[PDB]
Design a protein around this ligand. Structure first.
Ligand code: MN
Ligand code: MN
Length: 226
């Protein structure tokens, strides 16, 4: 796991035990209001992040209710499963939605983090490309006021360095976690896909759990894809 401090320009490379202590520190710094610009490199095999760059019809943030976010989780999981990469059995994967604080001149954004589902970069690009054939996702975004529902998912989401939670550019404010969902898929019951909001998200180390390269989270336990 490699970390980039865009403020000090320095780079890092930590082990599991160290990372958690690294993330323990960063988490402390987060709950103290410190401004951070930490990025993690996705590498070639890690969690998935979807970066949505929204152009809006008005200058007000979309509502993005949990009912809508739950719908997007289902659609995103369909394209994940369609990549034919999930392992057999019953497994728990988590979706996290971090949102831009405010709409600025009609521009808005949100990130969908599935940090525990470790997969290859080629698999991520296939899912990202497949997610743009999805008329249901486009309609959902359209009903939210998004002016570019056909071109809002950044194709480089599979390779761009990913901001750690609480980090931002020296000019911008960091994205804020709105809610997170728990999805359970079972190869012995493929039609059953329960999606529910995670209980007590605030009780976890958010920097650690949402990390795409972390494998020692408490809530987010890794599920390795083919
Ligand atoms: Mn963005
Ligand atoms: Mn982008």
């Amino acid at each position: 796991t490699n970390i980039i401090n865009r403020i000090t320009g320095k780079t890092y490379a930590l082990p599991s035990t160290e990372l958690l202590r690294f993330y323990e520190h960063l988490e402390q710094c987060r709950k103290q209001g410190a401004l951070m610009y930490f990025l993690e490199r996705q590498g070639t095999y890690s969690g998935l992040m979807l970066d949505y760059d929204l152009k809006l019809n008005t200058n007000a943030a979309p509502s993005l209710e949990s009912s809508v976010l739950s719908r997007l989780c289902h659609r995103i999981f369909v394209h994940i499963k369609n990549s034919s990469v999930l392992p057999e059995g019953s497994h728990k994967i988590h979706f996290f939605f971090t949102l831009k604080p405010e709409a600025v001149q009609g521009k808005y954004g949100f990130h969908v983090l599935i940090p525990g589902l470790k997969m290859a970069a080629s698999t991520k690009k296939s899912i990202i490309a497949s997610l743009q054939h999805d008329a249901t996702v486009q309609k959902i975004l359209h009903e939210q006021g998004v002016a570019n529902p056909e071109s809002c998912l950044d194709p480089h989401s599979a390779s761009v360095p990913s901001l750690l939670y609480g980090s931002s550019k020296l000019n911008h404010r960091p994205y804020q976690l709105k809610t997170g969902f728990e999805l359970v898929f079972d190869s012995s019951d493929p039609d059953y896909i329960p999606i529910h909001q995670i209980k007590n998200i605030e009780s976890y180390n958010l920097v650690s759990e949402l990390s795409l390269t972390n494998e020692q989270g408490s809530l987010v336990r890794p599920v390795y894809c083919a």
